[PDB]
RNA sequence: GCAGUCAAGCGUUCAUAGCGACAUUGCUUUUUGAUUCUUCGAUGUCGGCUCUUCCUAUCAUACCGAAGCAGAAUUCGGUAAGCGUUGGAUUGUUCACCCACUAAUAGGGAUACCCUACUGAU
RNA sequence: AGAACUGGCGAUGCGGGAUGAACCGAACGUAGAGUUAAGGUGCCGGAAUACACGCUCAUCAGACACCACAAAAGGUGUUAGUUCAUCUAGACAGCCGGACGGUGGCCAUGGAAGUCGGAAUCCGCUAAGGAGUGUGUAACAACUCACCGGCCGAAUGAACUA
């Protein structure tokens, strides 16, 4: 079944394992790009400011 | 659970010790594990393995 | 295989660590459980159970009638 | 699917309904088959049960040795006559429908084979892979 | 079927049987009928119901009867085992009675369904249905008695040890309080009790062992008392019929010691009583518990008994005990050889030179694998296991072999261009060929050919 | 879950005033049997 | 037997907007920085892909296998405003919007419906409210900093940067999955009139959800609507009606590529080493070119070509291996789908054909 | 079914004027599975599909108890209707009954533009 | 369905029965006031969430006579009882001890000693102790209550009824 308690909690411990850690590092990885995009557009704005 | 302590047994082979102040808490915890180590699909008349209680006494 | 061997395994390994306590407790509970049953069982098992309990009663009635 | 069939089967197109004549690629001299049955069947109303490459059937021999005729025995499909898709990317097909005979366990009835067998059945059935002279 | 009977799940009592069948037929078949429905439907209803009840009954009884072995002409050995143990007459008459009851079920079925097409009304037809069901119930409660016997034999039949008389076996027999259980447990993979009382082994206990790449089974006796020499209890008759029927060797396990329920003079006369059952059995006697006694000092009359055992053609004394391994395996080996006693191309080398086999030095130089060593070769399934399981681990197919350099072993083959992918191009001297065409274009560029 | 049907206590007329109308006739039968 | 239909998408009517509207988001995690929870672009066509396979245990482990993908135009996406939302015992409540002091002709052309006759007066009082101090703005902003347990941001696309010509911008709201709502709106306020990549939300080895509106097919009756057989009333008796243009949601979608417009040779694996963008010969089929970022995801999204979709980053912490496998492309087919395409580049066309009458 | 026994109780009061609870005994077509190919006036009009939903007294799929359960699988029973129950062979006929697959191949019930309902649309 | 007396219907409205071919009440000019019938007074609904004694807690409670009823019975749910019994000369619960001989009673058996089993089934001392309810050894063995006494002290048990 999809929604059996045994398969579910057996999947919850694994979700608490490697997968959520991969995602927690992925979100920092992508936060780096998400924040440096502002820096790229801001140095373009500096090229406008000069 | 809260207010219950656990001690792996000294100088008694294959033994575990519980200690606390709340009878209901310690007994519920003792019951949980012996349900979680419960055998299924099989004959307990031949298979033996399982955790049970030696006795239920005070600390003192 | 190997004619009767469960008893051999019993004497060599015991019945369980704790079986006798469960065995006592089952019969400690059965009094409450049987009446709780016969109040339950909507339809035809309140008939079969009732006939069973009646046969039990009349059998023990024959036993006390023995003397 | 049954016993002997090491590994799983991946989905392929389905060409062979029941009543579908095919060749017998064996070395017993048996010549043809007439499918009656499939093992590993789907369940649906009004369907015709399909067989395909890698699958295992029960079927007759309509022409061959008379001692084997008027008797039912299992078989494996070896040539499909319908287009399928191996994931290593290509579409393909053999020309003719053919199926060889074998015991229910998977062991080949005859000792040898004529003509090409698909990669799928070859990978699937080791006794096919041992008695077969050809691959594709 | 021969050598095992397990596909008989149980036989219930008559009351359990009828309760189960009647509950099944109340459940499955419909139960709701009014009077105002039509008479075709009302006849069909009770007809289907009684037919389904007969179906359930006969479907039970076929599993009963076909489950059982039909002992007549299956084996004289197992048939005699059943004769001593399982009350042959009760067995046959009970199964015959229930088969007769099956015929009675079919008869009442066919008679009632012959009637019921003329069903007219409820006070007739409902009572006809009850009448048929209670009649088959009357057969059921007529057939209560044998079923407990049938069940209790079925409990024991599945837990029998299984021995085919036609194969090589080793019929080891010893006295009560002889040490045969301890001896068997030492020699063989066998769980048999070692408390020294007489009737410790209760039936034909089996123990396996190996010799000369052959399987061998060890059949233990419960002990025997032949004091009438005609009649012995159901425990003792089993090994008697085994020694009668099993076409294999027999091993006598003698104990010439005080730790018995009887004297030593009883042992030799018991041997003499059982003498006629050694026809083709190639007997071999061995003395046990011998370290305490050391019978080299044994007295003249008892030694005369030892010689008086030895008139039969096949007989052999040995000495062993139940603390040493070498003598017990020796007697086991030569007993198997006694049982054996009772039981390619050339090249021509077509050549002048020899084709010697190639075995390089490294396969001999390497160490044979130790299952447990603190440090050893790692058996890389076990390397996989400690990082992920055995299904989830991806393995680098690179970085496991030799090359010019291991730095770029992880390098990606381009393997592809716009067209005509490179592995049809790839060889050495490609720069030499490039120069071989560089000179050609150097010719043709200056000749005005590309005008 | 799938909690099962509840059977009525509605008017639903057979029972009630016409059947033990007949059961008043059953009291008549009681009188008829009481003579014996 | 089964029923010749589902029952979940039962009121089979057309949706109200071609923008399939986000209904669900994964809740929050107030330990991280802010990560945008969605993005949106315009579907353009399909291609075929082969891919070497690190799938431990599977039959196709360490093999090449052909599969099939789609492609979507994913330009940078500019933020224009925010809204707050507060929990009630009714649900949620829009309590303030705030906009970003200068708005494109595109979104001004969205909110108007007959453009050229309009005077285009869309925010002329709002930009006047953006005074020397922005007093009312900060008033209606710090309110949201106080209230508004969860907050969204408005986006609009840059659709002029696509081969498509509609001139109009597709608004949306997007939820955040960071904490510190003050930090959320401060981040967004800094992002006012600033734009965002798609490799700054997504990356490879990822799963997404694809929510869109399907292709329409008009008023097709039972036999092709439900796949039902051919020779009072209940609502599940397989009666004819509108097909297509329903909203849907497709999940467990394995991305393979996060493309880039500036990156030449977007079609380049490590293997090809050919300077070709993924825009194949002939242009796309009813779509143009791909000179922007893009996504290459397997399966097939609901939609038709030159249709919008919305993206969500899989809404929970997946558990399957396939959600975590490591992708490696080997080859992009780059042939024209305007026919049985054979050739990747027109230079290859020249090379295999040779020179021709019109060539000289 | 019929006829007893056993007989909690009932009867202006009651064994014996008389009924009667539950078990038991009487064969009812054969004590050693040898079989017996027994379909013996089926007297009615439905039969067979397209195809929807509901009931459970569940045939598998869930979780459980006990059973000589050493295991595998099976024998019963309990909560369980969430999801599923086939392709052929044979008669105007539903009566009758096989082959093989699959996890199983459970039982039941419920002209037509006109207004309504249903599917869709402003 | 076979008979006979009487009544209601049919020709006959009206209040109540939630609504009605058969029930309760009551037979009519048009109108006003008053008072009642049968049925009812949480709200729909005019009329009290009146007072008083009890009972009952239903995993479909029950809510009206004849206008959807079943018994027999089962029930360690609750109440009121009847009749038998024991009891500060110590009631019952609970703890401890005692719980002996010929005896391992008779054949039965290969082994069967209080209990695989059939027959019998007693007597001494006894406060009490059976040729011995269950536990169980191949046998024995060991343990318990039923049978008694101690330590605590007030009521309590059995059967039957509704």
Question: What tokens were used for C49?
Answer: 């159970």
Residues of chain A neighbouring G34 (CB-CB closer than 8 A): 31, 34
Question: What is the domain range of residue E416?
Answer: 396-451
- The approach used to solve this structure was cryo-EM
Q: Is residue G344 a contact partner of residue G334, using CB atoms and an 8 Å limit?
A: yes
Whether residue D134 lies inside any domain: the answer is yes
CB neighbour list of residue E285: distance below 8 Å, 6 or more residues apart: E252, E254, E309, E315, E316, E317, E318
Cβ-based burial of D125 (10 A; exposed 0-12, middle 13-18, buried ≥19): buried
- Please provide the DSSP assignment of D24-47 as one string: --BSSS--EEEE---BS----TTP
Q: G87: helix, coil or strand? A: strand
Are the beta carbons of G56 and E394 separated by less than 8 Å? yes
Question: What tokens were used for G113?
Answer: 């419906």
The total number of structural domains in chain D stands at: 1
Best mutation target among G66, G228, G230, G298 (most D Cβ atoms within 10 Å) is G66
DSSP character for G165?
-
Q: Which helix (H) or strand (E) holds E212?
A: none
Question: What tokens were used for G36?
Answer: 């945008």
Q: G176: helix, coil or strand? A: strand
d(CA E200, CA A8): 53
Question: What is the domain range of residue D74?
Answer: 15-136
Residues of chain G neighbouring E415 (CB-CB closer than 8 A): 271
CB neighbour list of residue E129: distance below 8 Å, 6 or more residues apart: E46, E49, E50
E375 shares its domain with E423: no
E360 shares its domain with E388: yes
| Beta bridge pairs of residue E250 | E171
Whether residue D7 lies inside any domain: the answer is no
- Terminal Cα-to-Cα distance of chain A (whole angstroms): 65
As a whole number of Å, the CA-based R_g of chain D is 14
E409 shares its domain with E437: yes
Where are chain G's structural domains? 10-75+197-214+244-358, 76-196
Residues of chain C neighbouring B50 (CB-CB closer than 8 A): 16-17
d(CA E334, CA E317): 12
Percent helix, strand and coil across chain F, each rounded to 5? 55, 0, 45
The size of chain A, in residues, is 50
Chains A/D: 3 or more C-beta pairs closer than 8 A? no
d(CA E87, CA E139): 24
Are the beta carbons of A11 and G319 separated by less than 8 Å? yes
- Terminal Cα-to-Cα distance of chain B (whole angstroms): 22
Q: At what angle do helices E122-142 and E88-115 cross, to 10 degrees?
A: 170
CA of C65 to C1' of I128 (A): 26
Phi, psi of E223 (to 5 degrees): 95, 155
d(CA C21, CA C23): 5
Q: E77: helix, coil or strand? A: helix
d(CA G290, CA G277): 8
Q: Quickly tell me which residue has 């009646």 as its tokens.
A: C54
CB neighbour list of residue E415: distance below 8 Å, 6 or more residues apart: E421, E422, E423, G271
d(CA A15, CA A23): 10
d(CA G345, CA G350): 9
CA of D41 to C1' of H33 (A): 40
Q: Which residue is nearest to nucleotide H7 (CA to C1')?
A: C62
CB atoms under 10 Å from CB of G81, counted, come to 21
d(CA G38, CA G310): 7
Q: Quickly tell me which residue has 């069982």 as its tokens.
A: C41
| Beta bridge pairs of residue B19 | B5
Breaks in chain E (C–N beyond 2.5 Å) sit after: 343
Question: What tokens were used for E38?
Answer: 């039509």
For residues B30-59, one letter each, b for 16 or more C-beta atoms within 10 angstroms of the residue's C-beta and e for the rest, the string is beeeeeeeeeeeeeeeeeeeeeeeeeeeee
- Output the CA–CA distances (angstroms, integers) from residue E190 to B48, E181, E182, E242, in the order listed: 20, 9, 10, 19
For residues G285-322, one letter each, b for 16 or more C-beta atoms within 10 angstroms of the residue's C-beta and e for the rest, the string is eebbebbbbbbbbeeebbbebbbbbbbbbbbebbbeee
- Output the CA–CA distances (angstroms, integers) from residue E272 to E227, E228, E269, G52, G310, in the order listed: 12, 14, 5, 83, 100
Does the CB of G335 have a partner CB in chain E at under 8 Å? no
Nearest chain E Cα to G326, which residue?
E394
Are the beta carbons of C13 and B48 separated by less than 8 Å? yes
Whether residue D6 lies inside any domain: the answer is no
Query: Is E153 marked as binding a ligand?
Result: no
Are the beta carbons of G54 and E394 separated by less than 8 Å? yes
Q: Report the CATH number that the domain containing residue D42 is assigned in CATH.
A: 2.40.150.20
Are the beta carbons of G269 and E393 separated by less than 8 Å? no
d(CA E143, CA G61): 64
Residues of chain G neighbouring D7 (CB-CB closer than 8 A): 59
Q: Where are the alpha helices (DSSP H) in chain G?
A: 105-111, 126-129, 135-146, 181-190, 222-225, 346-353
d(CA G270, CA G330): 7
Does the CB of E27 have a partner CB in chain C at under 8 Å? no
Q: Is residue G110 a contact partner of residue G168, using CB atoms and an 8 Å limit?
A: yes
How distant is the alpha carbon of residue D107 from its chain centre?
A: 13
CB neighbour list of residue D76: distance below 8 Å, 6 or more residues apart: D54, D55, D56, D57, D99, D100, D102, D106, D121, D125, D128
Q: Where are the alpha helices (DSSP H) in E29-121?
A: 39-67, 76-85, 88-115
As a whole number of Å, the CA-based R_g of chain A is 20
CA dihedral (E400, E402, E407, E408) in degrees, to 10, reads -90
Query: Is E53 marked as binding a ligand?
Result: no
- Please provide the DSSP assignment of D45-57 as one string: TTPPPPB-TT-EE
CB neighbour list of residue E90: distance below 8 Å, 6 or more residues apart: E146, E149
CA of E91 to C1' of H32 (A): 9
- Output the CA–CA distances (angstroms, integers) from residue D3 to D39, D125, D128, E334, in the order listed: 11, 10, 14, 44
Q: Where are the alpha helices (DSSP H) in chain F?
A: 20-34
Best mutation target among G33, G36, G100 (most A Cβ atoms within 10 Å) is G33
Whether residue D68 lies inside any domain: the answer is yes
Q: Long-range pairs for G7-12 at CB < 8 Å and ≥24 separation?
A: G7/G236, G9/G246, G9/G248, G10/G235, G10/G236, G12/G241, G12/G242, G12/G243, G12/G246
CB neighbour list of residue G333: distance below 8 Å, 6 or more residues apart: G47, G48, G49, G280, G341, G344
The reply to whether domains G10-75+197-214+244-358 and G76-196 share a CATH topology is no
Q: Which helix (H) or strand (E) holds E423?
A: none
Give which of E199, E177, E201, E178 is closest to E191, Cα–Cα: E201
Phi, psi of E219 (to 5 degrees): -100, 115
Give which of C1, E301, C59, A41 is closest to G79, Cα–Cα: A41
Whether residue D3 lies inside any domain: the answer is no
Tell me the pairing of strands E284-287 and E317-319: parallel
Q: Is the dihedral of CA E413, E418, E421, E426 positive or negative?
A: negative
Question: Chain D: nearest CA to G3, how far in angstroms?
Answer: 12
CA angle B54, B55, B60 (to 5 degrees): 125
CA angle G221, G224, G228 (to 5 degrees): 95
DSSP character for C3?
S
CB neighbour list of residue G159: distance below 8 Å, 6 or more residues apart: G42, G75, G106, G166, G167, G168, G169, G170
Nearest chain G Cα to D10, which residue?
G59
What is the CATH architecture assignment of G10-75+197-214+244-358? Answer: Beta Barrel (2.40)
E401 shares its domain with E441: yes
d(CA C47, CA D64): 66
Phi, psi of E304 (to 5 degrees): -65, -35
d(CA E182, CA E161): 19
Tell me the pairing of strands E249-254 and E284-287: parallel
Whether residue D67 lies inside any domain: the answer is yes
- Return the CATH number of the domain spanning residue range G76-196: 3.30.1430.10
CB neighbour list of residue E58: distance below 8 Å, 6 or more residues apart: E102, E105, E106
Query: Is E180 marked as binding a ligand?
Result: yes
Are the beta carbons of E391 and G57 separated by less than 8 Å? yes
Q: What is the largest CA-CA distance in chain D?
A: 44
Whether residue D55 lies inside any domain: the answer is yes
d(CA G125, CA G140): 16
d(CA E408, CA C46): 81
Closest nucleotide to E63: CA versus each C1': H75
Nearest chain G Cα to A10, which residue?
G319
E375 shares its domain with E389: yes
d(CA D113, CA D51): 20
Give which of D100, D64, D94, D67 is closest to D82, Cα–Cα: D94
């Amino acid at each position: 079944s999809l929604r059996a308690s045994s398969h579910l909690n057996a999947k919850s411990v694994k979700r608490r394992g490697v997968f959520q850690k991969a995602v927690d590092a992925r979100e920092q990885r992508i936060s780096d790009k998400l924040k440096e995009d502002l820096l790229k557009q801001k140095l373009e704005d500096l090229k406008k400011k000069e | 659970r809260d207010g219950v302590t656990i001690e792996f047994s000294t100088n008694v082979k294959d033994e575990i010790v519980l200690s606390g102040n709340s009878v209901e808490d310690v007994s519920q915890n003792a019951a949980d594990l012996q349900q979680i180590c419960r055998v299924r699909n099989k004959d307990i008349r031949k298979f033996l393995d399982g955790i049970y209680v030696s006795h239920k006494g005070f600390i003192t | 295989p190997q004619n009767d061997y469960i008893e051999r395994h019993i004497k060599q390994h015991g019945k369980r660590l704790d079986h006798e306590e469960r065995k006592r407790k089952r019969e400690a509970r059965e009094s409450h459980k049987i009446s709780e049953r016969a109040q339950k069982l909507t339809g035809w098992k309140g008939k079969q159970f009732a006939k069973k309990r009646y046969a039990e009663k009349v059998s023990m009635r024959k036993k006390i009638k023995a003397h | 699917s049954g016993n002997g069939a090491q590994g799983t089967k991946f989905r392929i197109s389905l060409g062979l309904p029941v009543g579908a004549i095919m060749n017998c690629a064996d070395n017993s001299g048996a010549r043809n088959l007439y499918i009656i049955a499939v093992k590993g069947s789907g369940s649906r109303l009004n369907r015709l049960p399909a067989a395909s490459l890698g699958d295992m059937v029960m079927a007759t021999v309509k022409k061959g040795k008379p001692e084997l005729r008027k008797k039912v025995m299992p078989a494996i499909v070896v040539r499909q006559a319908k287009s399928w898709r191996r994931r290593d990317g290509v579409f393909l097909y053999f020309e003719d429908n053919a199926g060889v005979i074998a015991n229910p366990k998977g062991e080949m009835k005859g000792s040898a084979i004529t003509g090409p067998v698909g990669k799928e059945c070859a990978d699937l059935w080791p006794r096919v892979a041992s008695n077969s002279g050809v691959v594709v | 079927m021969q050598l095992s009977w397990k596909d008989i799940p149980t036989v219930a009592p008559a009351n359990d049987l009828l309760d189960i069948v009647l509950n099944r037929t109340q459940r499955k078949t419909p139960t709701v009928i009014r009077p105002g429905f039509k008479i075709t439907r009302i006849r069909a209803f009770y007809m289907r119901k009684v037919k389904y009840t007969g179906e359930g009954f006969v479907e039970k009884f076929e599993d009963i009867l076909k489950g059982f072995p039909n002992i007549n002409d299956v084996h004289p050995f197992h048939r005699d085992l059943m004769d001593t143990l399982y009350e042959k007459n009760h067995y046959k008459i009970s199964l015959a009675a229930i088969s007769r009851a099956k015929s009675l079920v079919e008869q009442v079925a066919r008679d009632y369904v012959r009637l019921l097409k003329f069903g007219q009304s409820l006070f007739q037809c409902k009572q006809l249905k009850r009448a048929a069901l209670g009649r088959m119930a009357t057969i059921v409660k007529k057939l209560r008695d044998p079923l407990a016997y049938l069940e209790q034999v079925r409990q024991h039949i599945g837990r029998l040890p299984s021995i085919d008389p036609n194969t090589r076996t080793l019929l080891i027999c010893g006295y009560p309080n002889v040490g045969k259980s301890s001896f068997l447990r030492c020699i063989t993979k066998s769980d048999v009790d070692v408390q020294p009382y007489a009737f410790t082994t209760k039936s034909l206990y089996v123990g396996h062992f190996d010799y000369k790449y052959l399987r061998f089974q060890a059949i233990d006796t419960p002990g025997i008392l032949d004091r009438p020499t005609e009649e012995m209890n159901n425990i003792e008759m089993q090994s008697i019929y085994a020694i009668a029927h099993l076409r294999s060797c027999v091993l006598y396990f003698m104990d010439l010691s005080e730790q018995c329920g009887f004297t030593i003079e009883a042992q030799v006369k018991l041997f003499h009583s059982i003498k006629p059952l050694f026809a083709n059995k190639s007997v071999m006697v061995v003395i046990n518990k011998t370290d305490i006694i050391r019978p080299e000092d044994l007295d003249e009359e008892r030694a005369q008994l030892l010689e008086s055992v030895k008139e039969v053609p096949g007989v052999e004394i040995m000495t062993s005990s139940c603390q040493l391994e070498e003598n017990v395996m020796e007697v086991r080996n030569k007993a198997c050889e006694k049982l054996l006693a009772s039981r390619v191309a050339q090249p021509q080398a077509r050549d002048d030179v020899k084709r010697t086999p190639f075995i390089p030095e490294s396969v001999k130089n390497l160490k044979k694998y130790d299952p447990e060593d603190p440090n050893r070769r790692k058996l890389a399934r076990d390397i996989e296991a400690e990082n992920g399981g055995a299904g989830v681990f991806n393995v680098n197919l690179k970085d496991k072999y030799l090359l010019e350099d291991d730095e770029w072993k992880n390098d990606i083959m381009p393997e592809i261009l716009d067209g005509k992918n490179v592995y049809d191009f790839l060889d050495p001297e490609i720069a030499a060929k490039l120069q071989a065409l560089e000179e050609e274009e150097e010719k043709l560029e200056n000749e005005g050919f590309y005008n | 879950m799938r909690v099962r049907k509840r059977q009525s206590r509605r008017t639903s007329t057979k029972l009630k005033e016409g059947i033990k109308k007949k059961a008043s006739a059953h009291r008549k039968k009681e009188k008829k049997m009481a003579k014996k | 037997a089964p029923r010749h239909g589902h029952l979940g998408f039962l009121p089979r009517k057309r949706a109200a907007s071609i923008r399939a509207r986000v209904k669900a988001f994964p809740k929050d995690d107030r330990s991280k920085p802010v990560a945008l929870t969605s993005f949106l672009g315009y579907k353009a066509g399909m291609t075929t892909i082969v891919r070497d396979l690190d799938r431990p245990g599977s039959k196709f482990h360490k093999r090449e296998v052909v599969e099939a993908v789609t492609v979507v135009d994913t330009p940078p996406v500019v933020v224009v405003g925010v809204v707050g939302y507060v929990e009630t015992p009714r649900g949620l409540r829009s309590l303030t919007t705030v906009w970003a002091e200068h708005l494109s002709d595109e979104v001004k052309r969205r909110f108007y419906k007959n453009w050229y006759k309009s005077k285009k007066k869309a925010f002329t009082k709002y930009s006047a409210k953006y005074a020397q101090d922005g007093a009312g703005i900060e008033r209606e902003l710090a309110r949201i900093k106080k209230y508004a347990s969860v907050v969204r941001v408005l986006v609009h696309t840059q659709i002029r940067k696509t081969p498509l010509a509609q001139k109009k911008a597709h608004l949306a709201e997007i939820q955040l999955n960071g904490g510190s709502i003050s930090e959320k709106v401060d981040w967004a306020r800094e992002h006012f009139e600033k734009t965002v990549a798609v490799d700054s939300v997504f990356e490879q080895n990822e799963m997404i959800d694809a929510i869109a509106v399907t292709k329409g097919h008009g008023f097709e009756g039972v036999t092709h609507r439900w796949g039902t057989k051919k020779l009072h009333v209940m609502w599940s008796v397989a009666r004819a009606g509108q097909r297509g243009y329903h909203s849907r949601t497709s999940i467990n979608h394995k991305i393979y590529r996060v493309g880039k417009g500036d990156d030449e040779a977007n079609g380049a694996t490590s293997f090809d080493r050919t300077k070709k963008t993924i825009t194949p010969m002939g242009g796309f089929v009813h779509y143009g070119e791909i000179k922007n970022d893009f996504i290459m995801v397997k399966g097939c999204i609901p939609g038709n070509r030159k249709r919008i979709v919305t993206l969500r980053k899989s809404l929970y912490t997946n558990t399957s291996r396939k959600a975590l496998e490591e992708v490696s492309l080997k080859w992009i087919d780059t042939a024209s789908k305007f026919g049985k395409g054979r050739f990747q580049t027109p230079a290859e066309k020249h090379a295999f054909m040779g020179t021709l009458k019109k060539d000289l």
